[PDB]
Amino acid sequence: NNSIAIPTNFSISVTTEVMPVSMAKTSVDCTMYICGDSLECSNLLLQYGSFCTQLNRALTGIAIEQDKNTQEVFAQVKQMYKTPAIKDFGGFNFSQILPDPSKPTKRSFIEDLLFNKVTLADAGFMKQYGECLGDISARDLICAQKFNGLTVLPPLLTDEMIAAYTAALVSGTATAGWTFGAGAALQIPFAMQMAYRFNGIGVTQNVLYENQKQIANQFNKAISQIQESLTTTSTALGKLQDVVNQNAQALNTLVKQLSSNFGAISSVLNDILSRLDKVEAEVQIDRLITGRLQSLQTYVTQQLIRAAEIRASANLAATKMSECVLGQSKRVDFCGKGYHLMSFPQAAPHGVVFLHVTYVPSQERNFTTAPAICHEGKAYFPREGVFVSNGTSWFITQRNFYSPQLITTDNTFVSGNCDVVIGIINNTVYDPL
């Protein structure tokens, strides 16, 4: 009841958080999947048009939402601030996250390492169609998907176009600070910006202005550790890989389900047509049509559920983009485990990666504390911070960092007597004369 713990040193930590944003857009065709190139099957399929317009409308509604998610997350500001020529903002080495004019692409180095982590084994919008005339070793699943009417539409925004947004946001938060999100861009040196960000934590303004070199060295070391850690582990980006694998597995299962005859005498329709007259062959064909329609319905329902989950994740990512990159708030553990809530966005294949910069106290030392002091019969409560004893004398200091200070009248305020409080001590209060 009379001991406190006040930290004497701190550290700057950079943590990575990966969030999926969008998934693949898939378009289906009822023709050349259910019936193929067969006029007799297509004649019987004309009575099920309403069962196909629903599937097409649902898939288009999914695809528009997938295109809208990337619009919502990344394009928060409509002003494309060009990147600065320099990369050192008061000792802060930003060259690892901003693009440099010495490479064919316009992505940063960390973005290149992120893009090399995700393997796009599945295809649909980069594989040529004329490549699908290969040998027995070229009988792959993608050519079967293209031959069975299952197509993958490309996304609207190019990755190099996403890189322009992320470079504009990083340049704006490096130069203007938090001002360009609320209103116009207001230039300010980075040191006072970081002093203001320290002021929103509870740490006084002097600490950065005394230890900015050590803080910059810790920041550079943290970015270098992130760079080194993003080249070895293959499980850091497992969420986007899981999304891609789920989409590919769903498409491959939809292709492989065509081998079921659904109670008919054969699975393929050609021998149904060539072995029997059409009087009972239409009875045979109806079962296959019903089974393939059921398979399409199941695939569309699962895609809708996955799209809803991706929409929820994208809404969370957009909220984190708005509240942690464009500004700093006081929500606990919203973006990173720590006090400082400043973040940097980077692009990733169908996703975003946030780098959170957090302030953590490290070195600890115990102390004796008192609630208030009674000088001349009146209690003197501290205006901010707590009262601390060195072991032989008393000071006032803030809770988040140990900076001892002499107890004066400006550090405290008077309220009432000193007989209603429990555990008050007696000392002297400095008054300038």
Partner: protein
């Protein structure tokens, strides 16, 4: 093989057959040779359309749709003067301009089309936003 007459896919679709006369293997391809998107303004506004083919080259268009077996109305959307090549594929029916406006009809891969001014369908690279510069000191 020595006794094989026809091969099968994983979907039990016959892709190759053996000719009973002059024994050799022949591949079978579907006639519906690709996916086609149609780009249009409102019907009350106009009646001209553009056609987008997925993942083909604009040399290879009148072999990938069998233009010789189609009506001459379809044959004007296979070749022409207003052809354009995008990352998504080949776009035929809209001319390409160098300007950058807002997105009206999102075609894909950074391209948006609109019914600009007689009036005709044009294709352009969409504009990301207003370019700005900030002086840091």
């Amino acid at each position: 093989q020595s006794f094989q007459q026809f091969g099968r896919d994983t979907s039990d679709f016959t892709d190759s057959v053996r000719d009973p006369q002059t024994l050799e293997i022949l591949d079978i391809s579907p006639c519906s040779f690709g996916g086609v998107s149609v780009i249009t303004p409102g019907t009350n506004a106009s009646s001209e359309v553009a056609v987008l083919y997925q993942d083909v080259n604009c040399t290879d268009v009148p072999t990938a749709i069998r233009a010789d077996q189609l009506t001459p109305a379809w044959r004007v959307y296979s070749t022409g003067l207003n052809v354009f090549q995008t990352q998504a594929g080949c776009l035929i029916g809209a001319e390409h301009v160098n300007a950058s406006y807002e997105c009206d009809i999102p075609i894909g891969a950074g391209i948006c089309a609109s019914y600009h001014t007689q009036k005709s369908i044009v294709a352009y690279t969409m504009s990301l936003g207003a370019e700005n510069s900030i002086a840091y000191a």
